[model samples]
Structure formats: structure tokens, C-alpha cells
Target: EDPQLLVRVRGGQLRGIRLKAPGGPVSAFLGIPFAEPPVGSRRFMPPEPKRPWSGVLDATTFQNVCYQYVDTLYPGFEGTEMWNPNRELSEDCLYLNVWTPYPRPASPTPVLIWIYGGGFYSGAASLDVYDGRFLAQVEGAVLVSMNYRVGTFGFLALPGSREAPGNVGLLDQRLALQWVQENIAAFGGDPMSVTLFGEXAGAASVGMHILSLPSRSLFHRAVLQSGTPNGPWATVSAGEARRRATLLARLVGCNDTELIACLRTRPAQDLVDHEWHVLPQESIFRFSFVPVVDGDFLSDTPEALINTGDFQDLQVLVGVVKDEGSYFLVYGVPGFSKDNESLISRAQFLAGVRIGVPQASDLAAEAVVLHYTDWLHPEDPTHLRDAMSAVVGDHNVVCPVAQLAGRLAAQGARVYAYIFEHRASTLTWPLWMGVPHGYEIEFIFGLPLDPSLNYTTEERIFAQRLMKYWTNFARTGDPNDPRDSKSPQWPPYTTAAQQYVSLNLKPLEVRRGLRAQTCAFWNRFLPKLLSA
Candidate 1:
């Protein structure tokens, strides 16, 4: 019989971590835990240490997911699509999984600690869409995906809320990175070689961590996938976040003090029931419990911090998708194009795109229409796909990511950028939302948008390439170089060269200075909107 693996984590020795060696001579390890459960008294608080266990805990199964109601892809989840995919749900879910070619000898491989984004309120590492096996088996690097507190349990913060208020999810991530610093060697990964990468809310949280002194020294590198904490879409502070939480407490009729305990007792679906509507920051939706930039933990808005060199030592990679505003058109582009008065009202609600162009305010709505609308059918694929790019890809994610990259470069950190241009495969949704938010995730897992798309031969090849790039990044600081001979060398990003790889269906070369006009215009008008 094959020998059983042993893990010497916080809580003593553990066995039953089965590693089925890869078919080829190359090998790697899968799934590892870095923390104890964040349940009971620790709920909504900072993640606590894992108590030493007397015996080895089973590593075969995934930990329970944090409890929360889910907002599905409202149109429909036809076929085997997992609209509200939260498998193995529980508050005790604070574990991480790994994929590596071979657990390189101690202090060996580069570790990409991935943080998923489902608003700040949702996202589980156990989802079928995020399997890390390929990153381990194929490219041969340590890919780490983790679970953090979600909904009220992870982000709830009142005026007096102390403990782990506002960014419990972010704090959990920082703690997990620390765990990597301490124990990654056991998994054949370098402790000091960790890179933080996330998409959407995950990206925003990573952005927060980059600016935090509390999270300083946790990692040496960073990557932002369509989310940036500096955007209007980024988290608000305790004052605003608490009022929203109070609104939620009143809606649920629980004492604000006992909320976490009470929420635990309620059904997981209850929290998922919270309504989500796309707000002012790009095309992503607003959730009941999202990250907030509280003064103490966050220090300042992420853009402000980046400009001030708050966490400047870290190397950075950032980019937006082709079109990010597709989701908003699902409700029809109503208020976005209304008169300036309506725009002012809408801008008031949004915290403002802190790092965008001055004309960003005027352009935001127009960008919405440009990205989300196709004159031919208006509601057809043209508008939808482009909208997806605008909403989630550019306005909410791209502009802010660019801002972060620019600042990091100014601080002497090597920054690389890319644009994911692959089209979505969901039949019911428009393809205009090209390479929509989180769409590339399924490809990394060797999964597809759906069977219906029957993805052409070229699409499959390109996606496989995308996965390899990600695995390569996890193995090294860069995603361009991989052992696979078929993959191309993706160059690093910079202002002088202005190089940003375009990961499109065709994978073309994007021209430099493309973003200058948009950036300059947004810089001019956005400040007035923010002050207003």
C-alpha cells in the first residue's frame, strides 16, 4: 500500500492526507489546511489559532463553507450549471488546498495564495469551479485557495464593533498568508516567495492587504484580477458599513450585539436571501456584508495608500477583462443615462471611483452604454458581452487595477498587466460580456461555461493555455514562463515599455497608450464628483 502522508501543523500530527501520484514521473501534493475553524466565539472575529489536535485530521474532504444566503445567476442556472454553488457549507470552513508539481523540497516552489471573490460576502474554496489539481499536476507549482468568513460572519461591523470588524475576510486572508510563511516549506513552497492573487472581491481584499501594515510582510508579491480596493466599488468604512449592518439587523430583528451568534443559528440559505443590486462601482453587485475601509485596519482608501507608498515594496500584476459591465444590462440600463441630477444622485450613493479619470463621472455612464449596449438588438449579445467587460472588467476593476499598477511602478515594484479577452460560453447570456468577471475560473478548473457552447477547438486550446499561465505564475513570480513548450513567454508590465499581454480568444497584442485618453479624462472629472 502507498504510504500515508503526515502533516505537522499547529494542532500536532495528522495523517490520512492521500496523495495519488500523477501518472507521469512528475508528481505533486494536493489540499492542506492552515487554520482551525472560525466558529462559535470566534465568529466574525479575526481567525484564531488552530488548537492542537491529538490525532491526524482527515484531509480527503473539504471543510464546510461559511454560512450565507446565495444570489444566483438570476436569469437561470440551466443544465448542470451551479448558479449558487456553495457545496459543503459551514462556519468552520477556514481551510486551504494546494496543487504542486512536486512539493518542491522545503523552501522550493513559489506559492500563489489565491483569494476568491463572491462579493466580500461569499466565495468558497470547495466550489467545483476552482479545483486546484491541474495547477499542481500540470504546471508543477503550489496553488493555494482558501475559505474566509462571508456575509455577516466575515464582514459585519457596527459603530462600536471591535474585534475583527469590517474586513474579517481580509484578516483571515492575511492570517492564511502568515500560515504560508510558517508552514509552506513543509509543502515544498517558499515562505518568503508568496504571491497574493484574487479576482473581483478577492482582488479588492488583496488590494486592502497590500496597503495594511497589519498584513505587511505576509507576502512579497501581488496580482489583481478585476478588482481593486481603490475603486468606488471598493469597501466603505464603519460609519457607512454599520448603518447598512444596522439596517440588516433591523431587517432580521436581532440585537446588534448578539448578531453573529444568532446568524449562526439561522439557516445558511437565510443569509443568502439578501438582495444584490449592481451599484455605482463598475458592473458588480452590492451585497449585504462586504469589505469596509475602516480607519484603523485599512488606514486610508487603497488609492490613497498606494500613492503614499503604504505597501510599496510588493511586486504587482494587475489587469481588467475585455468588457465588465454586462451584468447591469440584465436589469436594463435605466438610471445610468438619466439627467445630471440623476447621475449626481447615483454618484452620491457610490463612494466615487477614487483612482479613475477626472471625467470618469461623465464617462462612467457612457462607458456603461458603450460596454453594455449594441444598437442592433440593444439587448442581444453585442451589448451584453461588452457590458460585462465594462461593468466588471473596466469601470469597477480595470481602472482601479491600472491605478494600483501605476502606483506600484512609481514605488519601484515591477508591475505586469493583462486583459482577459475570452468570450463567455453561457447560451442564455450574451457573449458581449466577453471574458466576463470570474469566467476564466472555470477554465482553470478544466470546466466550461456550459456544454451547450460546445466550445470550438480553438476556445479549448486557448483556455488550456490560460490555465497553464496561471499555474506557471504560481510556480514562479511570473505567469509567462512554464515548463510546457506550447505556452508563450508572457512579458512583464511597465510604463516605459507599456506592455500588457492580452489573453483573448485569439491572444493579440494590445497597443500602448490605449488607456491614456480614458485615464486622463477620468482623472479630470472624478474629483469633482467625489467632492460633490
Candidate 2:
């Protein structure tokens, strides 16, 4: 019955399923393998391109998610539940999914490839939150998402050994992009007009692809939601990566002399179980295994690379949500939830600042705490919570992303930035957590397009507007659609004005300098404090 949805790709013929959506019918080819399964001897190594298959491949359903440790940071919470993988987990999971509009247009459409984010430890493309049906149908773009290895399986960096050269997860993404370049035309996608976009670690991955010399040509445009390589938690140095890898090996009873061989013999679950043991403390802000500045993949730190202009010259759209750290506070930190009776004391807030910026001197840390504190209501819990959230959001995401936008603009690349202030009506988070991290994803993917979701008319309109902005950027490196007179013109972010749009249901006018003084503290003054 699905034979009519047949499409010939590099591997072989794939039979997809035709699904109905709010915009129209869309053809989804799910679970298409882009690389050889990185199992057995291939573990820790860069992915090998998939060889041709013999018969018609059944791509009607999604495949196994790459083996990952499902995080239970906020058990039973809708946010956590929405991100957990629903498919079987296995090592043979180097698959990708493609969604195209039904009855394809004559000309090739712009492509948007999504990279999922789980702090580089846990994420799967098969998750329901990342479904591309509505995005494809409404935006009329070819949507692609891939399953890459995560945690110990993807980012264990052991240098000097050919078997484990590090950053293989990124290599897997590069291979998938290569696959798209060679085969996307079959799905009516333009290889020359590809845009790479993601949120959190996915956004960081998009930034990596931009900085990586080998990955630049794979995509023509970029969209970073709430993460970047410049973020402190986004990457680890080579020495740090090896230290963690060595610690993981020891935790799993593997010897240093024969690390690769011994690790290969251990069960995949054992690696995931022991990976976090390398972390000194159990903080959501820190990660054990992540992308590394490997001599080959990344020759230098992200900041250094950007300073030297080693990154790709491309059009970029990057932004963050208003309260990016509220999600971290509610989900990761203890005693910072809605049901908790006691408020966080001022002393505890100061201690948090110290812990968050371990490298800062006493004077610098105090300055930070003082800068974020509300002078009028110094002891108020609500003010303290907002202050800490601002601290975390500014240090971890907002400042770094703003720095990236400014740097790219300085490097003569056209850039557009935004701050998402809208929260979904469907979210169950407390009212205090305003527009937390990754909340913009639902709107970007057009979740409101579904009437059954009971989204308000304004919410549905917002989703449509957001989708149009994204699709227009993918199509022409500009988020503004000249044909759409209703939406206000989004100005390019220049270093002088620092212009960015406030993406909300309200008038949607241009805003100048998002958190200017606070970002200066985090990006400029704070770094000077550490260096001194």
C-alpha cells in the first residue's frame, strides 16, 4: 500500500509512509541508515559510510535509538518525559529520518537538518518532541534528523590510538551530512541550500559544525537555539577528555595498556553506568563526556577558532529563551522546586555563585552575587531565585550565544538574533519558571498546528510566524519574508546596535541589547577576573 512512497537513496530503495498533518499530507521515510553500525570493533571510532543494500528497505517505522542513559533528573515531570526516547536502544542505531511534503514540488526545496540535544550524553532523534511531520508539511522544507552515539559511546576521547581518536559523535553527524549531500535530491531537497539547526547541545553541535573545517561545506546556513561551542559546559579540553576517559576505563575495570580492547569487551550498559562516575560532583551544569578539542577535529578552542576566523563564513540565526536556567533549577538542583517549602537563603545563593564559578576569586565571586542580587528585596526568595536563574542562564547560555552573535557579525557574516519570551500553554511547569530552556522548540516545530492540542488562536498564530521565520532563513539566509507584510522586519544583528527581535505574541518589534550589562559581566568582566 505504501509502494507509491518509494524513494531511491544511496543505500537503496526506501518505502515511506504517507501521514496527514495540519498543513497537508507528508511523506515520512523513517529509520534510514546513513552509516555502518558502530558496534564491536567500530566502537569509539569515526563512523563508516553505509554500504549499498540489496532489497527494498522498510523505512515506515523508526529504528533503535543509540544506547544512552535515560536521565531521571525530574522524574514524572512532563519536560523530562517529553524528551526520553521511546524506541528500543541498541548500538546499531546510526539511522536518520526524513520528512517531505507529499506530491513534491518541481524544484528542490531547502533542507533543515535537526541535531537533538541532551547535554551530549542522552538524546535520540526518534523522540516525539522532535517529530518533523508538522515542520515539513507547514514549512514545505525537507526535514532530516539523525541518530548519533551519545555519552561514553560517542564522546570518549582517547588520543594516540587510532581506534579511539575522539569526537566520533560529531564525525557521525558529518557523515550523515555527507549522506544528505549525496542523496537528498531523491527526497526533493537542495544539497546546496542546507541549513543546520538545533537547541541546547544540538545547538552547540550546530556551532561545532560551523567551526569544524571538514563540516563547513555540508550546510549553507545555521540556526543555534540556546547553546554554542563557546558555552563553558559545551566542551572539554583534550586533557580533560582523556582524564575522564581514563577514569571511566578504571571504573569499568579496564587497564590503561589495552584500553580500547578492554572497553570493547564490556557491555554497553556498563559504559553508560560508569560514565558519570568521572564527574567530581553531580551537577546538571557539568558533563563527563562531550565534544573535545581533538587535534584533528578541532585544532583549538572555540574562542580561539572564532578569533582567528577559522570558522565558516555563513549566515547565522542564534538566540536563547528568557529564563534559560529555570529548567535547570527545577529539574537538576535540589530544594529549588515548586513544592519545596523553604526559600533559598542569601548565604546559600552566594555559595551557589562560588560553586558555579569555581575559577573566580573571592572578590570576583562576591561581585557576581552582588550584581545579580535585588538590592530592594535582598532576602526575598522569589528575587533570589530569579537572580540565580539569571546567573545560570547568563553564564551557561545567554552570554555565550550573544558573544557568538557579536563575533560572527564582527567577522562579516550576516546574523539575526532573537529572544523567545513565549511559553507554551501545554507546559505544566510552575508559573515562576518563565520561558525556560528548550521551550522554543515546540513553537519552532509547529506543534500548535495541531488543533487537537487546543492551542489558543494567538498561540497557533505565533507558531505559524515562527515556522515562517525558520523556513525563510533556510530558503534565503534571511528570516524575514518579503511577501508576509504582517510580521515585522527582523533586523540583522550589528555590533554597534546589538539588535535582536523579541519573539512573542505581542507587537514583535526590534529590541536592542538583550541583557547588555549582565552579558558584559559574564562575557567581558568575568573572564578578565578569571584571567587575572
Candidate 3:
């Protein structure tokens, strides 16, 4: 039987049901593109439009996930277990899923385009973590999520890969947005008002594209959760990213000429299991698998284009977490570094702060000790964890966020910078990875527990509130006027009190000042400090 309210899109046939508002039942139309698989030579190429369909396609089930190491769940995650290990994974998975509360076109609603983040390597539009009902019905907006190329297929920067490139992952995202511009109106969304939002790597990708010439004019507004674009730790150049892709091709016994073709024909798991060692997330600098700062897509570096107003004009909401490196800190806490040699090296570096605060040896050395002490607690594993978190977090996450905020505020774009400090009450071990790396996201998209990571009902409510502020911003440039409506006194960041509206934490202060001074010691002195 045809699913109640079915419609045929340009690509294929879709079946949907008209859903009501807020407290309404599951009376809705959901279309998950099931046909026109993007496999074979189409691998690595941009997602093509659906091949079209004949009879009514069933919308009862979701499409399969792209090839990924998804079998490794986050410990105690709930929901139904994926039964077929090999069946549901493939490169042919170009499926898109949609949830519509008010399926009719009487009233056009705001659209939220979500780009999921898995270090730009894993994640998709189909992940169970994201549910659009709340964002769509309760908050009154259209929610669109999509899958993009990832891992080898996404950022593979092989020899010819360099010549033929921009990140396919980012490109996939751009194309998805293009699809929205062309088709979302049919689903009752205002294409012009589409707000591109993503978290972590997704946020970082959104940040980069907002600055990239390729994505300019694709989406009108942007929101980046727990992310910023500048830093050696965050992105990679196309030339280098290609080099890394080349290395992987060699390891897998495939060259640039045969890679895409071979990869498409290969089993889905083979692609999912493509774990080339050098490109692991730990080796962000050497792995060469990030969005390249190409002369085309990302024509200018984040520092160059964004700082000087070279990027397209748009309202951007970007930020970081309170203890952004909490995850890394927790990861390192078990084996606290007690090496006298290591401590001595740190001491030497502290004493060598020549450009900035040339101080007495004792003070400089004490500074490193002090940094470690205050950043985390010694009694708790978290204390030791904090020190390591600072090393990478400062270079990768913190400074860049601060700098992006500073640069944008200086340029006079409506920039709102924030740091989420809320912590889930069910956390077990304490580590400086407070608000662990992706903490804000769990609350933002209202993701349920991964079972591996503990979260609670409080998190769910918090996430809804976050999406409200965000979807509001996407709909209109301001994140104010939430559904609940007790809007906070959020202000644009300026160089006044050096304040940041620390999310959910007390002293929701708005900090002011040059980013150079606020975290100057880390900003400018990193090359010297780390190399020493």
C-alpha cells in the first residue's frame, strides 16, 4: 500500500505522512531516499541526484549507513543492535532521511542543515543521535541532515588526488546544501533562510566553508558548536592531505589511477576498515587528511581571509567548550607523566620565554608547574589529565576559538562566542576533560547515551534548549526568543571585559581584549615552547 501521503521528488519517489505540531502524535511524512545507490566509479565523486523511481517506494525503513567502523559502538549504547555486519554498510549509501511535522506547503518553515562530525572521518545524516521531531515540530523549523564522504574517500590526498581536489567530504556537504536550495521548498522550507549548523569536525567544516569561496552563498547563516577554524591542529592543506592519501593508496596496493574505482568495487567493510596508521586523528599534523587550504575551495587561509574580511558576509555563531580538552585529559590521566626528564624539559622551556615574559628562572619554571597544578587536580586522575589536555587543547581547540572570536568581533560581523561549561551529572571518573571534548553536542542535538558515555535527562532538556537558540539563529540572525522564551542577556562579544558567555556556568561573563594577550603565552609562544 502507498504510504498515506507520498510524493515523488526529482531524484526518486518518497512516502510521507502529514504530522502535527509540538504535542502531536507521530503523524508525519518521512522520506528516506532508498534507490539510486552511489557506488562503483561514483565513489569519491559528488553525490548525484537520485535516479528517479516508478512505483511508491516504502518509507517505513531507513537507508543503510556508509562503510564505517560503526560496529564499534560507544560501550553501552541502546537502541536495536545492527544485525547484519556487512549488509547495512556500503559506498552506495547516498540515502537521505527527512522528518516533517507539517508536511503541507501552506506555511514555509526555517530549515536547519546539520553536518555531523566524526573528525571529518566518521558520522552521517542517519546516525540515531539526531532526531528532528523537536527541532521541527516543537521549535517549528525544517531539519535536514546528510551524509558526506569521509576517511579515505573524503580526504584522500593522493598524487592525482591533489590535482583533482577539494575535500570530497566538504564538497558533499556543499552539494547537499545545493539540493536543499533546489528542492527544500517542496518540503516547506525557505531555501534562502537555510542555516548551516554542525558540531566538532562538522562545526570546523562549517567554519572553513563559510570562509571558503566554494561554499559562499550556498547557505545564508552558520552555527558551529564547540568549534573554530584556525590552527595547525585543526585543518590540513590539500597538497599535504593528498600526500597522506597517496601513502594510504600505497599501503592498500592501489594507485591514484585505480583507487576510486577499486574502492567502489571493493567490499564495504574493506573501505570501512581502511585504517592507514599515519593518518590517525592523533597525527593531525602529519596525517594530511583535513580540509586543504587550496587556492580554490578554501582559497585563503582562515587567518588571512577571515581576519581581514575576505570571507563571504554572513552571521556566524561559533564557540568552544569550557573544558574543551576534557576528553584528552581523561585519556592521559591513567599514566601520569612522572619522568624527571620530562619535567626538566618542561622546566627548561618555561625558563626560555624570551619574547614575552622574560622572567626569573624560578618564576618561569614555576609557571609550568602552576599550569599543570591549576589546570587539573593532582588528587584526581583528572588533575594529571588536565596537563596533557592543555598541551594539545591549547594548540588545537582553545586558542583558535579565542582567535576566531577576536578576529570576527574586530571585523564587526554579528559574532556570538560561547563556551559550554555544563557537565552531565552521571559522570564517573573526574578528569580535566570536564565537559569532555564533544560534551556540548550531546546536549545540542539531544543525543541519547552512547552507553559508553554516561548522560542524563538533564542533558536531553539542555540539548533542546541549545537547539532552540541555534535554530532561532538559523531562522533569524539572532539566537534569542527561544520556545521557552526566558531569553538570556546574551550580548555580542567585544574587547571590553574580555568576557565570554560561559554557557550554563556561573559568571556568564563577556570577556574583552586582544586574543593575543588573553592567551598570548600559548598563542605566540607555542612554537618556541613546544619545540624546546
Candidate 4:
């Protein structure tokens, strides 16, 4: 059935639906083309603009999700159900969606282009949890979400070749942003007032765009939630990227002169299914295919790029949840069980941090152990788990995020930092798993959860405050602008005292120096450890 509303874009007209929401009707144009189908020889190349269509296009139902694994290897994960594509996998997945209150506005409205995250291997923009109904109606911004290639198809930096580039997925996102620049004004979005935001890999991608030279003028503001270009999953060297590509090519019987052409014709599902076996089994966080420094998209390591002022002159918001690494450990550990596996110890703590710094010394490993150790009940398995959680979360996400925030602030960029401290009462796993990674997304999106589940009065209030803070930042690049008397103050982060907004129901207090001593240790010792 055709949707009630139709609007003509650059390529053609599109049919969209008016979704009834708590606030009002939200006009959602779903599954619109931002790029041509990335099939045939275009599988590994940068995205090309979508070809023009002849007639009005169906933009109601979401199109195919990008090819990705869906086996039960990582069952019960928060991502398995929601992150996995709802439709059949396809390489023809480079699409974008927009949700707004108006079909066409008298004046341009601010935009929030969201990039979803699944460790850079699996994610889509069509997930119901990411529905922008409430955001478009109440927040009064044109909300945009996009899908990009993932896994080997997204980031295979085949060596000695111009045919294959490393960051094709990132490039897909760039093309989507360019599309918004060219056509979003027609949808009531202010292309010049766009804020790029995402969680995990999506957030990491936003940071990468900030570092890349070409994306400088594409976005005016940025919001990174629990991700950084320095995260363990964000980058790989050219040599490693090529090695994985070669491994996959060999695994699929295509390591030859015509390798690029051979890969283009292989079944999309076959590639996604075999991706798991080709990836390193050393750790849960280790994925074979990821963004790499391809000299064009990324000239060097993100750290090196930032040192050269690659990320200067931008408005940035950086943050993490209270227990960012707990979700992974709970779901990834091979033999880990919340009920039976209770032998977490000093060795476990050392092993966990080692994932972040594979080259660190025994002394470096022990430094993390000593700092995160539980004094009262040092050997208690539960204490050990909590300690391990702190070590990994800080090492992988929290501390590095703080470092990035500080560097950006010092470079005279407008910076805001946050820590999500509110723990949802419904997500009862264990006290040790305090507000697990990606937990803040529900509150941030105001997503509808299990019908049986209900938020407390305070949670509802906090959600409003949180949404306003996010949307306001998208609109004006300042969460506390216009001086709403009741709006909680969110001060800009600076290197002087290193302050951040501690996001909570208790009036959003400004806190000082997140994990100062721990970050100081890693910051001080890493260059020496890694340089050697």
C-alpha cells in the first residue's frame, strides 16, 4: 500500500507515512537511496551517488540490511536481536532514512544524523529501537539514520591494489552526509546546521570523519557516545588489514590475479557467514575486518592525525556509560556464567586489560591490577569481576574517551564530556554490571521497551532532560543554551580542571576528572610501552 504523503527529492518523488507519536505526527521517509547499489565490482569501492529513478519511489518499508552474521554464537546479546538486520542480507544496503515533523518547512530545521554501532561489523539504521518518532515530534529536528557496509566487504585493504580501499563503510557514511548536504533542505533539514552523532562504531566513525581532511565541511557539530577513534576496535594497520583480506580470499578460493572480480561475484551470505571463522578468536572484541589507515581516507593513526590538528575547530561532545565493558564480558567470555563462573582473580584482571594493550609489560599489566584492586575483599570473585570491569571499561573506553576530550578541549575546540550514571531498574543483571554499555541508548532515544516494563516517574523526567540536552546540542552546539532556568547546566570541558557533566536523575552534577589517576597512569606509560 502507498503512504499518504509524497515529496519530490532530487532523484524522484518518495512516499512516506505520518507516524502517530506521544507528542504528534512524525513524517518518516524510510529506505531512501543515498548511493547506488554497492553490488558487482562496486562491493569494495567507495560509494557512488544513487542513480536517478523515473517514477515515485516506495519509501515506506525499510530496504535490505547490509550483509552480516546472525548465527547464535553470541546469543542473548543486546545486539543480536536489534542489531541484526530485519530483512534478508544484501550488498544493496547503502540507504538512508529521515524523520521530521514537517514535509517541508518554511525555515530550515536542525538535523541529527545518527550512525548505529555494532563493533563495525554489524548494524543497520532500520532497527525499531532507533525509531525517531518521538525525537522528530518533541525535539523538533529532522532526524536522519543511514546504513553502511560492514565486515570484510566494508574494510578489506587489499595490498598493492587500487581496487580495494580499507574504509569503504566510512566512505558510505560520508556519501550519505554529502547526500544530506545536497537534498536535505527539501526535507526541512538545515544542511549547514547538521550534527553527526552515534554510539560505539557509529560514534567512532564520527570521530574518524572529524579526523579525515575531506569531511571537514560536511558536519558542523559532533556527538560521540561510548566510542573514540582510539578504541581497540576502531583501527588496524595496512599490513594487518591486507593480511585478513588475503586470508579471506584464500578461505573463499579467490586469492589470485582476478581476486577483486572474484570477490564481487561471491554470494553475499557466504561472505558474512564465513567472516566469523576468518576473524581472530583470541578475544571477544577482536574482529578481523575494521577501519584502517588507507593513506586517502585515513593518512595515519588517529592519535598522529589529531597531533597534526586534524580534529581542530569543531564542536564536540564525548562520553561513556558507567560500566561500558560489562556487557561484553557477560556475553563474550567463553566459560563465563553469572551463576557458576565465580573465580575471577588477579590473573583475570591482568588478562582483561591486556586486550587493550597487547604489547604492555608485566609491570604495565600489574599497574592496572594494583589500581583497580578491591582492598577489603581482594580475592572475592564478585569483587574481581567488578575490578575487571573497571579495568577493561577504563582501558577500552572511559580513559581513552577522557584523553580525547582533553585533547580536543586543549586545542581550543568547543568540547562537552559526559558520564551516564543512571542505571535502569529494568536491566537487572548484577550489581557488578552497573549500567552496562549501550544502556544509555534507550533513554537517549526514548525507545519503547517491553510492554510489561515501566519507567519510574524520575526516569521519565530524566529522559526528557536527556533528550532536550541532546537535541539542543544538535540545534545550537550547546546543551545548556538559551538559559532555561530549569535545564541542568552542562559546562564545556577544558584541560585546566577536566570537568564533565555526570548525567543522572540527581540534577546532572558537574564532576571533576573521571578516572584521573588511572588515565594518568595509562597516558604516562602507554607512549613508552607502545613506542618500544
Residue by residue across 470-528, what tens digits does model 2's lDDT show? 99999999999978777668999989999999999996789899788889988888777
Clashes of each: 43, 0, 22, 0
Instruction: Encode model 4's per-residue lDDT on 1-532: one tens digit a residue.
Output: 4333687888989988877777567788899999989888788888899888988888877888888866464567544465567787888898899998844456899999999988888888988767777688777778999999998788777845878867999999999999899889888899989999999888889999998878877899999999988755689888878878877877887843378778777887767756767655445556778899777788878877765673456899889999987767755553345445445766666676665345457776666677777788787777777776776677778877987888788777899999999998666455667787887887888653223348777787777777888988988888885766764578889888888988988887888997888888776665576566
Those runs of model 4 whose alpha carbons end farther than 4 Å from true positions after fitting are: 1-4, 71-80, 102-104, 255-257, 278-281, 310-312, 338-343, 350-363, 428-430, 448-453, 486-488
lDDT of 2 at 193: 93
Clashing pairs in 4: none
lDDT of prediction 1 = 0.61
Decoy 4 TM-score against native: 0.93
Candidate 3 weakest lDDT stretch, 10 residues: 351-360
Query: Per-residue alpha-carbon lDDT of model 1 for 202-291, expressed as tens digits?
Result: 888888887888786787777778888786656776676777666655556454557645655655455455423212233335555677
Which stretches of model 2 miss by more than 4 angstroms? 1-4, 255-257, 310-313, 338-342, 358-361
Which should have the higher TM-score, number 2 or number 3?
A: 2
Cα lDDT of model 3 overall? Answer: 0.59
Give the total clashing residue pairs for model 3: 22
Candidates 1 and 3 compared by lDDT, better number: 1
Q: Is candidate 2 or candidate 4 better by lDDT?
A: 2
Model 2 C-alpha lDDT versus the unseen true structure: 0.86
**Which candidate should be chosen as best, given TM-score against the real structure?**
2
TM-score between candidate 3 and the true structure? 0.79
In terms of lDDT, which candidate is strongest? 2
